[PDB]
């Protein structure tokens, strides 16, 4: 499924930014 | 699965907005 | 239906990015 | 269609963080 | 199809991310 493999990079997309966020801070 | 990537990019924003607000 | 939603967020996300482009220039 | 602007807007964004990344490199 | 082109793009956000998470590190 299509969906399924675009909300799991979404998740993976959220996990990186979290990952900035906590560099940057 | 679209409740699902609203709410992910709902946290993504959250998320660049806050980015947005340590660069500045 | 969510698709306007999902539109509008992405949209707000490129102004984001926008703004942090800017904010990296200068 | 909603589709190919999604499609458009994520283009966008890939563009984006690739001009983010040569600012950063 | 678009759903293709959205899985593809999303990939490369993918790797953008780890490329900023890398130069972040680095
Ligand atoms: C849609 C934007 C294009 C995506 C970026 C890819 C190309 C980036 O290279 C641009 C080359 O221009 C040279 C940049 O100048 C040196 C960088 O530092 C100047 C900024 O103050
Ligand atoms: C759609 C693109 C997805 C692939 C991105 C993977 C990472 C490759 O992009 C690297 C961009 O950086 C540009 C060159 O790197 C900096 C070179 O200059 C630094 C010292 O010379």
């Known amino acids: ?3 399924k ?3 799991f ?3 993976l ?3 990186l ?3 900035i966020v906590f ?3």
């Open 1 to 3: 499924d299509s969906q």
């Open 5 to 7: 493999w675009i909300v």
């Open 9 to 11: 990079l979404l998740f």
């Open 13 to 15: 997309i959220v996990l």
């Open 17 to 19: 930014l979290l990952a």
């Open 23 to 25: 560099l940057l801070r």
